[PDB]
Paper text:
Previously, similar close-ring hexameric structures of Lon were only reported with the presence of substrate and ATP analogs. In this structure, Ac4, Ob5, and Ac6* engage the substrate polypeptide by the pore-loop I (Tyr397) and II (Trp431) residues, but the lowermost Ob1 contacts the substrate by pore-loop I only. The three protomers Ac4, Ob5, and Ac6* are tightly packed. All of the substrate-binding loops in the proteolytic active sites adopt an active conformation, albeit not as ordered as in the inhibitor- or substrate-bound states with ATPγS. In the close-ring hexameric state, the pore-loop-I Y397 residues of these protomers and Ac6* mediate substrate contacts; together they are aligned on the trajectory. However, when the substrate is present, binding of the substrate to the exposed pore loops of pentamer may induce binding of pore loops of the sixth protomer to the engaged substrate polypeptide presented by pentamer and promote rapid formation of the closed-ring hexamer with stabilized substrate interaction.
The Lon protease is a AAA+ protein found in prokaryotes, archaea, and eukaryotic organelles. Lon is involved in cellular protein homeostasis by degrading damaged or misfolded abnormal proteins, which prevents these unwanted protein species from forming toxic aggregates.
Residue numbers in the entry:
A (entry chain F): 218 to 505
B (entry chain E): 218 to 433
C (entry chain D): 146 to 289
D (entry chain A), E (entry chain B): 218 to 289
F (entry chain E): 506 to 577
Amino acid sequence: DTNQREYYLREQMKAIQKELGGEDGLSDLEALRKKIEEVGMPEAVKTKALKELDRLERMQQGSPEATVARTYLDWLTEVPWSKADPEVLDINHTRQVLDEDHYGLKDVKERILEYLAVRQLTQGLDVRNKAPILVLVGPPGVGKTSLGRSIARSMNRKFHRISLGGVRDEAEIRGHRRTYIGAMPGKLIHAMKQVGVINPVILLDEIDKMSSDWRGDPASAMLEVLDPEQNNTFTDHYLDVPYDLSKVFFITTANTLQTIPRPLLDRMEVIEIPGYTNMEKQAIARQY
Amino acid sequence: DTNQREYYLREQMKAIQKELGGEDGLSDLEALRKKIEEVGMPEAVKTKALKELDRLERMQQGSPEATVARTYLDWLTEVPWSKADPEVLDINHTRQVLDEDHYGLKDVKERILEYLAVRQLTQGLDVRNKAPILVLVGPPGVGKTSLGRSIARSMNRKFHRISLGGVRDEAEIRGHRRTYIGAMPGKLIHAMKQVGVINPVILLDEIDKMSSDWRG
Amino acid sequence: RYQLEAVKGTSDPAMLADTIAYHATWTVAEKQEILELTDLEARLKKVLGLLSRDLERFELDKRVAQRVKEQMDTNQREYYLREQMKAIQKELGGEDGLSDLEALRKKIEEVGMPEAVKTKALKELDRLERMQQGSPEATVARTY
Amino acid sequence: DTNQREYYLREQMKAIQKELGGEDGLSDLEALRKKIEEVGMPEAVKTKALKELDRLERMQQGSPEATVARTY
Amino acid sequence: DTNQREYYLREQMKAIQKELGGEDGLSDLEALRKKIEEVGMPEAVKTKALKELDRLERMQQGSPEATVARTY
Amino acid sequence: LWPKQVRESGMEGRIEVTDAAILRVISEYTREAGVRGLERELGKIARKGAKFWLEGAWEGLRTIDASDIPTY
Ligand SMILES: Nc1ncnc2c1ncn2[C@@H]1O[C@H](COP(=O)(O)OP(=O)(O)O)[C@@H](O)[C@H]1O
Ligand SMILES: Nc1ncnc2c1ncn2[C@@H]1O[C@H](COP(=O)(O)OP(=O)(O)O)[C@@H](O)[C@H]1O
């Protein structure tokens, strides 16, 4: 008798589940599907996502395994593909914005300004666009971290910062096999989830303290993520599809040049800040 | 007459599969027959395929076993099965193809040329059993990773790169154990899924820095 | 419905608001509003919102029951038909399975191999043999 | 209208489903998120919490993903 | 139908068991609450124990997290 | 590397370098076993040339000598 009622209750949830499917699912997931078919990863890349989409959809409605792949599909749909911020603008307007946020920093300002010169010279061409990586080395007192917002306001870009360094979990950088209980794509990908552009501003705060040895090496994982050309086809442990990380503009923060593994050290665009002068100190004290 | 009984029972089970097993059973009669026709299935791999083929006909009503079984079957459908690429006949042309991708590297170029010359002179199947294995050691600045793509393009063998940059638990590089969600984000076989050729050129991020866990 | 079909002869908006508000098909918090509202015109208006949402629930709950009852029959009928189709093939598979496997074992039992291991498998095999549906243990017993 | 209609349907279905099994489950979560509406966090994480609770408001009872999803 | 009949017999045996074994299991949880009562733990620890037994009762058994939760 | 960075900078046919300046470039700016750090410098050359071109465009092509390295 109890089994009868339980079964009566089940169809009750089903009727409710079917009603919900008519809302969150069905046409709603059809619209998202066609939308991703419009601005999602290429079809040859989307193939894995389609693999999971077919099984999770084929799985009985409400199946945890369906949700196990449903999170993967939703992550692929939410993460931007081939969508970017508006391209190169006038350098004269942005140089004042970069100058007013921070006094001095001539080398970093020159780097930021000249990054737009090539963007202007490659207007309408058919060449691969690769945003250079950035590393800032210097004492912790130097305002390297504020560059994450300063540069973003310089090019009106969207910015997010991930507190890397002093970490021992490769699976954090490259997520992990979606098969394991739950699921968490690598931090980078988590940072770029909310930024709806393929060229965000990402700030690797103090990656110098990166700790390896025991456990999957977070740093060794960032090798595939920070490869200058292989980031065009990037397959972390969670997102099996080759991610197009080429357009992403990277900024990394460091305090010295003697605690970094060699493959990381000889792959960055080195920018050094030896420290402000005392005249610069009194000027910045007076102004800001 | 008994053989026709067997055929009638087989067509009955195929009909039930086609009518009910959405994307499993009608996909069976439509494409799995041609699947063996295009990629092929070892009899040992096929006998068990047929043994489990009638077991996952529980779609519409719903069966995670049917889906995970179907994920396994779909993985079997596309992985190359004794289907080789058109073997290279002009190693001299490959020489120029490899010379137009890199400069120098006279050691690895000659190594690959020897490996192809032996394969072209394999009289009797006694060398194909031992797949040649190359490990590349040196500073990271040297172009080792793109060498995989260069060699594969010169071989006319489709290329796939596998992320060995960081691998901790076991089965993170090899195919994960079956029976579960049935979702595998890349693997050694995954490269085989990418390349429909039984003999591709596959490169890894590195070997010195890989497995590092307690469970596996 | 007895309190509605007795005072239908009066067209007082306040009286109709009282009739549609006394039948409290909601929480007592809403009943405080009608209890203390110096706006008979808004009385029926706010009651309209409650009864309209309640009417949505009225039809919605009826539809849920209709969906559950129709699904009940479909699930039952599907269960009977689908189970038979599978149990038929699974019955054949079971015979073609351990039943054929154990035969092969018997073929090599010509050496008088101890059948105690078989009898243990038979315990599993009698139970799963009777169960012509599911029984994943049958597969593990098959490999055993 | 649509938002309130789907919230009310979710609340009633959660109520019945958790009365039949584990009352202090997704009904507890829906009450808690109704509170977090009144004590609203930054908009960046408000939508994240809503999406997170919505996806786990449809799975079965005692799901292995739900074991950590409820605690998060 | 024979499978249904043996299911009938097995749930008969389950009835016999849950009469003695199952009620002992319920008596085990009832005695667990009696333990959390007798010790006289302060109010915060009371609420923590109540929430913990609430999260345990919602989920099923035979999971790695369940062992740690049970022991703790 | 030079054709690739020139194509990536879009200013094809506008900058050229002699065979003597490159010797100084490697012998004085980058000392690594590989050439991964060399592509970053060779693209910096084009990135700084583009800064001059954007403000003022010249005619024809520009040849870089060993004495013109510090400017770019
Ligand atoms: N030129 C400058 N203009 C404005 N603020 C500055 C300047 N130089 C340093 N600062 C300030 O110094 C501090 C440095 O802190 P932070 O950027 O977090 O350092 P780090 O990047 O080393 O962690 C910030 O408050 C920053 O605004
Ligand atoms: N002799 C060479 N010929 C061609 N490219 C070279 C040569 N030496 C180095 N390279 C370049 O080195 C780079 C290596 O990058 P990649 O293979 O991703 O990483 P890694 O340097 O760690 O192997 C490629 O851009 C490649 O073209």
